[PDB]
Amino acid sequence: MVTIRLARHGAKKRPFYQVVVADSRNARNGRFIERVGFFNPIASEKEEGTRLDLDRIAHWVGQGATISDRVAALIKEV
Amino acid sequence: RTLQGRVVSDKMEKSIVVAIERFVKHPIYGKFIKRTTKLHVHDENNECGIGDVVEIRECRPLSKTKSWTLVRVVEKAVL
Amino acid sequence: ALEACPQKRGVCTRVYTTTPKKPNSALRKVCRVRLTNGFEVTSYIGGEGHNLQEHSVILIRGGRVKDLPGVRYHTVRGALDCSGVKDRKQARSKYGVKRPK
Amino acid sequence: RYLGPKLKLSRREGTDLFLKSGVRAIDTKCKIEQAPGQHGARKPRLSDYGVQLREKQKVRRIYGVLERQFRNYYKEAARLKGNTGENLLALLEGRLDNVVYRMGFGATRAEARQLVSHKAIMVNGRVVNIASYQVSPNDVVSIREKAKKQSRVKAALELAEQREKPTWLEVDAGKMEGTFKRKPERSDLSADINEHLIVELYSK
RNA sequence: UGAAGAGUUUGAUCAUGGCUCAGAUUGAACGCUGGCGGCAGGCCUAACACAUGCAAGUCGAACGGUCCGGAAGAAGCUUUCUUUUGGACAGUGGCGGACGGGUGAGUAAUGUCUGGGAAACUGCCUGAUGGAGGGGGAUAACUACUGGAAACGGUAGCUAAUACCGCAUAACGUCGCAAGACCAAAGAGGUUUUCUUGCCAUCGGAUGUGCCCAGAUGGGAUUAGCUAGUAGGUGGGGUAACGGCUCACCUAGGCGACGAUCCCUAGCUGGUCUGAGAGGAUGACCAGCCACACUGGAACUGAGACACGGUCCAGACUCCUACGGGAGGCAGCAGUGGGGAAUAUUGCACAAUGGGCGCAAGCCUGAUGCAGCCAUGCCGCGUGUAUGAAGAAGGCCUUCGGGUUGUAAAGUACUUUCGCGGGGAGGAAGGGAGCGACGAGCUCAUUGACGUUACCCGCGAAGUAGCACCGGCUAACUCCGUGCCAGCAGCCGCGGUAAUACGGAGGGUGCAAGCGUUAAUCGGAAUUACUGGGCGUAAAGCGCACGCAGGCGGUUUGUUAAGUCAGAUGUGAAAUCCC
């Protein structure tokens, strides 16, 4: 089942997530279908805490792609 | 896919073997090498005889060894 | 060493003495060892004195002894039954000798 | 680093490196101009490899840096465009500990390295305690507000008055600050080094 | 933007030629030594045998009893007992173990890689269309009895559903001919005339696969003729499906020096190391695929496992045993013993991220996040800083005049890693409650392993260093001892009384908690040379002829245009590499 969740590039004291759409089977940090944006928990690296690219996910959503609870929050924030 | 070859045998019925030949460069040396392959093409009309240079196209598997069929004859004969 | 191993254990078959070649003269101490590799080779015994008996059982390092043709290996002192040289105040790294107090 | 008798290195290199009291008439190179040891007297015999070796030696000794980083910095300068020789000194001269020395905050590079490690030196506000820090142009290197009181820098900066600074630099004794104008060229630096020889040694 | 060679076969020279060297790397080990911290990393050797614990459940919005808990009754109190209700276990009933995790034994084959084809299939989830009328039947629990040491088992009686079955409508679909006939389906919960969860049939979406095909995929021919279903045809059987896949009959072919057949070996790849490139080597960490769980074989049930904690049969072994008969299988985690040169805490924890089930609350989750041990590696830091004699003492050398180790130590001043005190982190919102129709939305409240660690502030003592080497390549020297004796040695060699190459000492060079040693990988080798080579005498034309296959082929014109060349487009996963 295709799902839109957060991929953790996360490094030591460098936690960054990549809201991506991919098969629920694949690993958390495996081959993803396509990146729709990014998330910075601390929002320290850049002022732009998150870039959703609404139109993009707006497509996957309705295509059968389901969004996780956490990702849904970020996406809902648009 | 279309392949050109010679009719090296018309012994079987409705079945003719076409000896297709090609030229490819050696992966190491690069010099052109000769390579051929025999394909059992279908010929319901038993129209093609031995020596005929015919064209061969991919078609619905008639048999296990036959997955090609005679399309058109290039030249009349060359033994 | 067979399995390209740095070292190889083995059991001594006989601890006899050998004489150097044309240019040299002495009673070099060697010993036939039956390594686990399945080979029975002769190894040299460095040091001024050793305590290798018949059932010695020692590790082989590997080294040719120019004077003794055939001896292509050296015994590692300080390992197994091969006691390290006594009173070695010098190169203790070799001969396996703990630094005195 | 090395940490040991520096006054002996000057004799070995033949040239007089500025480690400390190089100004005073004490600097052994003033008394006995021969390398240390019981053989510093007999006539030495140098080979092609020797001249290149001793050459880079004095070079690295001046900045008092390890042979590793020194080599690493060499590789870098050799990668970037422009004459390697020039770039070389540029990088080594870019070291924070070195800059501080050039600014006069420290009597020598060794003391400068200490000042940096002691967090007694800042860069563009934020403090930096890494001697290997690469100072870029337009960067301001001043003393710590809290360290402005320590007698050591008080005496160092005091002697700095009236003393000229390199063209690629500019200090303000009053504010006890400093600015890195640009990367110093080989023309600006007057080191007893022959960059053409140090580059050959690493060739091999 | 990319390429230095040197030593040694001579009395000397040139050439040919082999061997060898300084560098970098290694999930290493060994020797001497060893302070701290961060990140990373750790049986590379037997599928050898294993003590002990642990490695999947969840639902009372499917139904009847025990265990744990609360509340309300009959009582003056006690005993006893009744009703209601929460959790859960035991049972019945429903949905889930073929995912994840481990290992590489086996494996040359469309197994894999790359590019295509079609004779196919796909739970839960999503979109669309239509429907859900009437009836019938069954088995445990439970109850009673009997057998057994135990495991567990036999018999009798009662009983329910979204459990099973028969009948309707035909949206449609299937079959013959052509333009005909046949075949379907369970409720429950409530803010209950309105929604919620769920069901039946069909089409489509999403995704994942079975099968087929072109090309590519190691070594040996002291492995050459091989083959009977063996090659093809008709019909049939069989499967989700093609196919001799299997069968009957007929035909007699099919394959091979572009190497079949046989034998040997090794999981493969993305990538990794190296190299100027080509290429060589490798594929260990991580990611994809494949193949394996006491040894061997097999099938069932299912969308899927021929399935580690499912089943059946054969075999050995271990344990239990009233011996009648049973229980298992760490190549799962940790660990034990055995092996080896060698590789670790039978630790902490779920809050965070992710996963399974559930409407939800919530439950499960040694997956993982961390700590521990080891300089195994990488990076950062400290053992102090400034001052201090034409120049102590001591050791060493001496033409004993003196020189050297030395500003080096002592000593003076300064800072002050450890340690102590205080403070103390990021990494994490809802369930609920209030407003609103307990919906959308808004508002508010409660709660954390590593840690009391990181980090900040205050106080504050100078407070481990070693190892290798000094004939030449290799940078760095003398004295004494020994004396071809003892010993050294990668190669050339050295030692028979003056040795910078033996041992010690002083000194010196290199490096630094590291330093050496051993083993393994790379080029130089233009020494297989495609780029880069040779064959009269240094290694090298086959003794000659004829001739098959194969390779190559004169001048002009035309067609095709396969090779070749050009434009566009698709593919060329991520990561990596380069900027």
Side-chain angles (χ1 to χ4, degrees), chain C residues 92 97-101:
Chain C
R92 295 157 185 167
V97 184
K98 301 181 182 60
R99 180 183 63 181
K101 294 182 176 59

Side-chain angles (χ1 to χ4, degrees), chain B residues 14-70:
Chain B
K14 305 181 301 301
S15 300
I16 287 70
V17 296
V18 182
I20 59 177
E21 183 177 300
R22 66 166 186 173
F23 289 66
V24 182
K25 72 176 188 302
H26 191 298
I28 291 67
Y29 299 65
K31 56 84 176 185
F32 299 67
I33 62 180
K34 185 182 64 178
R35 288 294 134 62
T36 179
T37 301
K38 299 176 61 60
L39 305 181
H40 299 58
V41 306
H42 180 57
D43 184 50
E44 57 177 57
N45 300 178
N46 60 63
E47 176 184 55
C48 60
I50 181 177
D52 290 293
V53 178
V54 301
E55 301 179 300
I56 308 303
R57 284 177 53 184
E58 302 179 302
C59 301
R60 176 58 186 174
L62 178 66
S63 60
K64 62 168 297 181
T65 179
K66 301 182 63 180
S67 61
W68 297 282
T69 302
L70 168 51

Side-chain angles (χ1 to χ4, degrees), chain D residues 182-194:
Chain D
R182 58 177 179 61
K183 298 184 180 61
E185 67 178 303
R186 176 52 186 174
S187 300
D188 298 304
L189 295 175
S190 60
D192 58 296
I193 301 173
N194 184 300

Side-chain angles (χ1 to χ4, degrees), chain D residues 109-147:
Chain D
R109 294 186 176 65
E111 182 180 303
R113 178 187 300 295
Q114 178 179 300
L115 300 177
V116 181
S117 300
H118 280 54
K119 188 258 180 180
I121 304 175
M122 57 179 263
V123 181
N124 303 300
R126 55 196 177 186
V127 187
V128 182
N129 63 300
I130 181 176
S132 62
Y133 184 63
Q134 183 179 301
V135 181
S136 300
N138 291 298
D139 291 306
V140 294
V141 181
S142 60
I143 305 177
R144 286 302 304 172
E145 299 65 60
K146 298 70 179 181

Side-chain angles (χ1 to χ4, degrees), chain C residues 81-98:
Chain C
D81 296 60
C82 182
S83 301
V85 182
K86 287 294 181 299
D87 299 300
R88 254 279 168 162
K89 315 291 291 185
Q90 40 181 296
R92 295 157 185 167
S93 180
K94 299 177 66 293
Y95 305 112
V97 184
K98 301 181 182 60

